[PDB]
Design a protein around this ligand. Structure first.
Ligand SMILES: Cc1nn(C)c(CNc2nc(NCc3ccc(-c4ccccn4)cc3)c3ncn(C(C)C)c3n2)c1S(N)(=O)=O
Lengths: 248, 329, 826
């Protein structure tokens, strides 16, 4: 019926990119840079946050089936965003995406688009659709972060700080392969979990079951605390490596 | 696996012939070589490259893979023309959206006059369409182009709804700017005629009501070629739009611009006196001018006409076929 | 775009309805006879019928009743067309000049309504207070006959009884009372209402409802001396009036269905009944007077008089003469005599009127080798079945060959100097377990005879139950000589085998000329037949030989010879068979994308398919590959009655709604999509049901005939007997003639004030469109009959174009010559 879009961390050692001689650090950084390209391009064009995420999910899934050495990441990114606009009903003309991409890319980077940028992108749409197996509908952590937060009652400012901080973590997790490891529901819980730890909040108190240390169980079933820690660790690693620090 | 769409080739289907052309590409009737199952193939041509893959097809791929109901048509898979080897750029081949094959379409049956509908027949038809429409309206999807041209029927009496090319999501909290000319004029809701542009799920209910009347008279209730002539015909039967029956009619863009000849009174019950009392009440509510007072899909299911209809009794519509092939002496 | 021309060679011969009245004057007795789109006025004399006038209308006459409102010297006539055009007409004669005055006009079509299963019913009050119309189920429409209602404005009264069988106004009521039979789940009932013009609604009727026969068919309003009504059914006749109830159930009427009633004695003492077997009965009302002086009905009696034609409507013409309005055979004038003849009959045929009847099929053959076509038509049904040979002898010469059984298809085999005809006759299950024919007919009077002994379906599973008295069809192939028209041979097909298709041709390398018949095994339970045969016969030395048989899984609706191969349509399938050197049909290639492939036509390697609901498909045989290819399909939903190929690009179709259309390849190769789209470039409402299209022309060809502007000739036959010709025009001639029509429309006075454009508009219940691509030859050929002042008025400001001169002024004399050339095509 529907395809499986989730892999194990151990499997990422065997992407096409890895087996063509690309090392783990290079692919990982390329994913952040490619994702960020999609994020920045769509932000300049004023696109809804779901549209950016859908393009990023297509992009991440794409490079589970192809190598970065044979498909320029930025062309793929532009193509993903193009399709994402039509899927999420926030359409943009391909020429405008190229226009914005040229604005944000230097001369070397825009060389990936070749002599005819629009053509290189429009051509790729065929491969993209076959690659993602025409499974266009994608859910994102954002809707669950809000659906779950709405069931929290208590100090309005404390909960809103939790939401925004978690929301920031969701945006940052788009640069990582977490989109390929865990369903969005778990991601939304994980970012709530992380924000709670950083803000020294005890989220259970705001739930309908204030004496249920496991508030996540009423939102997401069969979620071990272990999973949430692995996700938190990866998000925090991105902040530790960069100069930016936890939002707080 | 069954889920890896877009790879299997169209060679696997034996084409029987062309059965239609609309929206993006032509529809063909085919038989699967392996299983022998009849299928319908919508050719999707991306060669234009103005906007690549048609968004009308994208909507129908996205929504119909989410929607599972016996009253909504199934997309079995998507298959491809023999693709150019090692030349992904040169490749201009088209995709085929594979649907379940439905025997007939309502329009052709009514148009040829070859279909007679009894009260019981009409119930089963509407009950399924509503079961489908409700399932879709509950998932916050709007069909936005209900027509006899795309209600499909099998000889068994099974109805399925089909043309999701214009279907989009509806958010109650955040009304979104939309496209006004969404349902075809013969089945257009008054609200869209006057420029509503912020449509409710009720727009699809109005069309189904028009069909309901079309099942008793065998003719579309409101037929016109101009957006204002349609309003006149609707106004004669349902009453002229007025603040008394439609409090927010003044907010509409073209309410002052578009006025009927008179302030007609509602005559629906009189002109449809021949309709059974249970259906007449359903028509009165489905064909209500104010979208907020217009009945919902579920409410039609909870009507004296439809609630106690049984799925087990298919009640297939009668087709003379061979009997009327030869003129009757 | 495409440009075509349609002309009526023979006017409709079938009778739709009849009433008699004092239309022209109170002194004159008049019989008004109605044929589709035609009105015929006569003055009835004891010597015969004398025609006063013949009128044409832009509409199919549905309702026709004669009424004389107080203050008129003569009766007026109400007419309602099938398009719901209504009119009141009055006779006016000034010396030698006759005109028909349109006193009132209006279209009574409602925006919302369901056409009744029984159809439009029309009646007029005995006091001429109102005209009653039941146009739609559940509604009763009233046109009040007031002096001021010149527009025939009307109102609807809600009617609870949705399925109404028949209705009449009653005599002898204090307020206008309708009596009608209706059907609901509990059976059929008779009920009465009173119509209040002041209240514009129904009031309780004079007498209560009664449950009546399940197959009660007709309602009779009995005159003042008796009052009440008579109800005619299949097995019983009943009289209803308040407390009075009489029922007679003679066994003679059960044998055949009675479908017409007419009053013989003005006081109601006698009524005439006719049935589908042609028998003529008399319902006699036996009076019993009380000492009070009140005349009451004592009993009812039915007496067989003789045999007439199957009557859709009957009329007594005073003296003893009775006009029999027949839709299936020749109409007649018959006198009912007091003494029976030596055979026991009281009926002797006086006058007989040619009716080409239903033309099921026809072929054009040059019998005399005079370079002139003769049209041999399968005409009539049941006892009235006949072969009609028609030639343009100037009047049309029609020879009749009585068959006394129903003809279905006809084909000509010159090699054998004979005609092959498919026929069916009605036998009835008898006490022997077999069946017995009601009368001898062509299939039983053949010189030599044979019966199929095929073992193909013999095994079957088990025989279905048979009840005595049930009807069955027996199908035959008739071999008929082309000169004597004598039945030379009759081949009876298997039991429960319906013959649908017939061809005469050579196949492959076989030098023999064969008769090939396609049949279907019809079982009452089967919605669609699933068994059939293609049978190859050879007519040689007075005997018909079975040469080969092919078993198919369906009904062989249509077959046609295709370049030495046999093209046959079996249900949804179109199939091409090769004729092997072993004299056996062999399949080659097939096409399955059809619902029911009813009709087939071929030109070269192109095949045209007509379908029960999917309109017309253009197929092609690709010889390099040995298979069919879909060229282009008409994607508009149309129910076909017949198809024809005009030329390689234009294809002609006939709809069951009495409409004709022409589809052409879109001739634009940009996209494969456009070529695959057949586009309906021509739309035209004929008013007739076309059963058969046949290429050919009856006009004499001396090789000296001036080359007419029209090119090509397709003849068509209709169910009402009308024969017409379709021919093509150049763009220059079409525009010239079309511009002339628009000029004629303003000049010629229309009966009922009916817009000509509306009458010829393509009309279906769901859609109504203006005519396109067709020139009404009848409108054009009427230019030669309008007065000179009108002729010159028509030609004012007329310019020829696209010709030798770009702009040329037209004179009234120039057009007279042009139209006269157009009258030479038929
Ligand atoms: C746009 C458009 N949207 N719609 C839903 C249609 C109807 N066309 C259709 N008709 C299906 N069956 C019914 C049917 C079956 C057979 C024949 C036929 C034709 C010629 C000869 C013999 N038979 C015609 C109709 C059907 N089944 C599945 N699909 C889709 C979902 C792919 C279908 N679409 C069209 S339009 N008008 O372009 O067509």
């Amino acid at each position: 019926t529907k395809p499986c879009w989730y892999w194990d961390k151990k499997d990422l050692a065997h992407t096409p990119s890895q087996l063509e001689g690309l090392d783990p650090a290079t692919e990982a950084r390329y994913r952040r840079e490619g994702a960020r390209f999609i994020f920045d391009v769509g932000t300049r064009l004023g696109l809804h946050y779901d549209t950016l995420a859908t393009g990023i999910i297509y992009f991440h899934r794409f490079y589970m089936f192809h190598s970065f050495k044979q498909f320029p990441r930025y062309v793929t990114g532009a193509c993903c965003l193009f399709l994402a606009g039509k899927v999420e009903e926030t359409p943009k003309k391909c020429k405008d995406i190229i226009k914005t991409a040229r604005s944000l890319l230097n001369d070397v980077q825009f060389g990936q688009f070749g002599d005819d940028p629009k053509e290189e992108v429009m051509v790729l749409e065929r491969i993209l659709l076959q690659t993602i197996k025409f499974d266009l509908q994608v859910e994102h952590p954002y809707q669950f972060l809000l659906k779950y937060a709405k069931q929290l009652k208590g100090d309005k400012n404390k909960i809103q700080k939790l939401v925004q901080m978690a929301w920031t973590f969701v945006n940052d997790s788009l640069c990582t392969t977490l989109s390929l490891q865990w369903e969005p529901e778990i991601i939304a819980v994980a970012v709530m979990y992380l924000a709670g730890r950083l803000c020294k909040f005890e989220i259970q108190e705001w739930t309908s079951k204030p004496m249920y240390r496991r508030w996540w169980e009423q939102f997401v079933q069969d979620v071990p605390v272990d999973v949430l820690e692995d996700i938190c660790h990866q998000i925090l690693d991105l902040y530790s490596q960069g100069k930016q620090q936890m939002p707080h | 696996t069954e889920s890896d769409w877009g790879k299997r080739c169209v060679d696997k289907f034996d084409i029987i012939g062309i059965i239609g052309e609309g929206t993006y590409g032509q529809v063909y009737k085919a038989k699967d070589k392996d299983t022998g199952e009849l299928v319908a193939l919508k050719k999707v041509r991306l060669d234009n490259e103005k906007e690549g893959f048609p968004i009308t097809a994208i909507r129908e791929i996205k929504i119909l893979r989410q929607l599972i109901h016996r009253s909504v048509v199934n997309m079995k898979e998507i298959v491809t023309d023999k693709q150019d080897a090692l030349d992904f750029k040169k490749d201009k081949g088209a995709f085929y959206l594979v649907f379940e094959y439905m025997d007939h379409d309502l329009m052709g049956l009514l148009e040829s006059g070859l279909v007679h509908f009894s009260e019981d027949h009409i119930k089963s038809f509407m009950k399924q369409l509503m079961e489908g429409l409700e399932y879709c309206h509950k998932k916050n999807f709007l069909h936005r182009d209900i027509k006899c041209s795309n209600i499909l029927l099998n000889n068994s009496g099974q109805i399925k709804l089909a043309d999701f090319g214009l279907a989009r999501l509806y958010n109650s909290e955040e009304s979104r700017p939309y496209t006004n000319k969404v349902i075809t004029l013969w089945y257009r809701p008054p609200e869209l005629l006057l420029g509503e542009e912020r449509y409710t799920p009720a727009i699809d209910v109005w069309s189904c009501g028009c069909i309901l009347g079309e099942l008793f008279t065998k003719k579309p209730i409101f037929q016109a070629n101009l957006e204002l002539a349609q309003l006149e015909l609707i106004s004669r039967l349902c009453g002229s739009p007025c603040p008394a029956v439609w409090p927010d009619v003044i907010r509409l863009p073209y309410f002052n611009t578009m006025k009927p000849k008179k302030q007609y009174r509602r005559r629906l019950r009189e002109e449809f006196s021949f309709i059974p009392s249970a259906a007449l009440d359903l028509l009165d509510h489905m064909l209500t001018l104010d979208p907020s007072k217009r009945c919902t899909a579920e409410q039609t299911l909870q009507s004296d006409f439809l609630k106690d209809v049984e799925l087990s009794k298919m009640a297939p519509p009668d087709l003379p076929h061979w009997q009327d092939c030869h003129e009757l002496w | 775009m495409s440009y075509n021309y349609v002309v009526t060679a023979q006017k409709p011969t079938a009778v739709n309805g009849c009433v008699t009245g004092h239309f022209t004057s109170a002194e004159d007795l008049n019989l008004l006879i109605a044929k589709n789109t035609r009105l015929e006025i006569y003055v009835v004399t004891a010597e015969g019928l004398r025609p006063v006038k013949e009128v044409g209308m832009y509409g199919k006459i549905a309702v026709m009743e004669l009424f004389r409102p107080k203050g008129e010297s003569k009766d007026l006539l109400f007419i309602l067309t099938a398009k719901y055009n209504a009119c009141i007409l009055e006779y006016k004669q000034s010396g030698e000049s006759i005109d028909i005055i349109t006193r009132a006009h209006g279209n009574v079509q409602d925006r919302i309504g369901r056409p009744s299963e029984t159809g439009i019913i029309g009646i007029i009050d005995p006091e001429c207070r109102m005209i009653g119309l039941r146009l739609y189920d559940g509604l009763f429409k009233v046109i009040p006959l007031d002096r001021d209602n010149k527009e025939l404005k009307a109102f609807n009264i809600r009617l609870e009884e949705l399925h109404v069988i028949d209705v009449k106004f009653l005599y002898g009521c204090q307020a206008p009372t309708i009596c009608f039979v209706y059907q609901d789940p509990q059976g059929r009932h008779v009920k009465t209402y009173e119509v209040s013009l002041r209240e514009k609604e129904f009031n309780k009727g004079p007498w209560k409802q009664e449950n009546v026969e399940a197959e009660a068919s007709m309602v009779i309003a009995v005159p003042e001396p008796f009052g009440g009504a008579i109800i005619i059914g299949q097995e019983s006749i009943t009289y209803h009036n308040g407390d009075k109830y009489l029922a007679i159930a003679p066994p003679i009427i059960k044998q055949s269905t009675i479908v017409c009633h007419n009053r013989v004695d003005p006081n109601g003492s006698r009524y005439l009944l006719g049935d589908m077997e042609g028998r003529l009965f008399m319902l006699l009302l036996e009076k019993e007077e009380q000492m009070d002086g009140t005349v009451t009905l004592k009993d009812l009696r039915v007496e067989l008089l003789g045999e007439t034609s199957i009557a859709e409507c009957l009329t007594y013409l005073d003296n003893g003469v009775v006009f029999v309005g027949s839709r299936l055979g020749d109409s007649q004038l018959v006198k009912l005599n007091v003494d029976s003849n030596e055979q026991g009959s009281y009926v002797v045929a006086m006058e007989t009127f040619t009716n080409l009847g239903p033309i099921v099929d026809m072929c054009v053959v040059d019998l005399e080798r005079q370079g002139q076509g003769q049209l041999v038509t399968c005409s009539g049904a049941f006892k009235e079945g006949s072969l009609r040979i028609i030639r343009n002898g100037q009047k049309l010469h029609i020879r009749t060959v009585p068959l006394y059984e129903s003809p279905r298809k006809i084909c000509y085999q010159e090699v054998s100097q004979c005609f092959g005809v498919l026929s069916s006759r009605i036998e009835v299950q008898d006490t022997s377990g077999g069946t017995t024919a009601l009368r001898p007919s062509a299939s039983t009077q053949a010189l030599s005879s044979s019966v199929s002994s095929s073992k193909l379906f013999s095994s079957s599973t088990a025989p279905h139950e048979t009840s005595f008295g049930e009807e069955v069809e027996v199908h035959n192939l008739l071999i008929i000589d082309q000169h004597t028209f004598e039945v030379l041979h009759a081949h009876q097909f298997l039991q429960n085998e319906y013959a649908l298709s017939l061809v005469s041709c050579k196949l492959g390398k076989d030098p023999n000329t064969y008769f090939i018949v396609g049949t279907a095994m019809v079982y009452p339970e089967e919605a669609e037949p699933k068994q059939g045969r293609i049978v190859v016969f050879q007519y040689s030395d007075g005997k018909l030989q079975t040469v080969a048989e092919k078993e198919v899984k369906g009904a062989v609706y249509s077959m046609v010879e295709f370049n030495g191969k046999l093209l046959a349509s079996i249900n949804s399938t179109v199939r091409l068979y090769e004729w092997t050197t072993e004299k056996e049909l062999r399949t080659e290639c097939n096409h399955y994308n059809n619902i029911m492939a009813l009709y087939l036509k071929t030109k070269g390697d192109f095949i045209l398919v007509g379908d029960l609901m999917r309109s017309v498909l253009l197929l092609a045989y690709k010889p390099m590959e040995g298979n069919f290819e879909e060229i282009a399909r008409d994607f508009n939903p149309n129910w076909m009655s017949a198809v024809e190929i005009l030329d390689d690009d234009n294809f002609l179709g006939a709809e069951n709604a009495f409409n004709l259309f022409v589809c052409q390849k879109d001739s634009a190769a940009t996209t494969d999509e456009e070529r695959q789209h057949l586009q309906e470039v021509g739309l035209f409402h004929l008013g007739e049901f076309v059963n058969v299209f046949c290429h050919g022309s009856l006009v004499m060809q001396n090789l000296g005939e001036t080359s007419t502007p029209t090119q090509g000739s397709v003849l068509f036959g209709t169910v009402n007997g009308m024969i017409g010709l379709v021919t093509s025009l150049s763009e220059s001639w079409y525009n010239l003639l079309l511009d002339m029509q628009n000029r004629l429309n303003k000049v010629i006075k229309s009966v009922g004030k009916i817009e000509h454009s509306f009458w010829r508009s393509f009309h279906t219940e769901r859609k109504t469109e203006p005519a396109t691509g067709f020139i009404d030859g009848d409108l054009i050929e009427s230019f030669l009959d309008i007065s000179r002042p009108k002729m010159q008025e028509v030609v004012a400001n007329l310019q020829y174009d696209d010709g030798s001169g770009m702009k040329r002024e037209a004179t009234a004399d120039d057009l007279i010559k042009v139209v006269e050339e157009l009258t030479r095509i038929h």
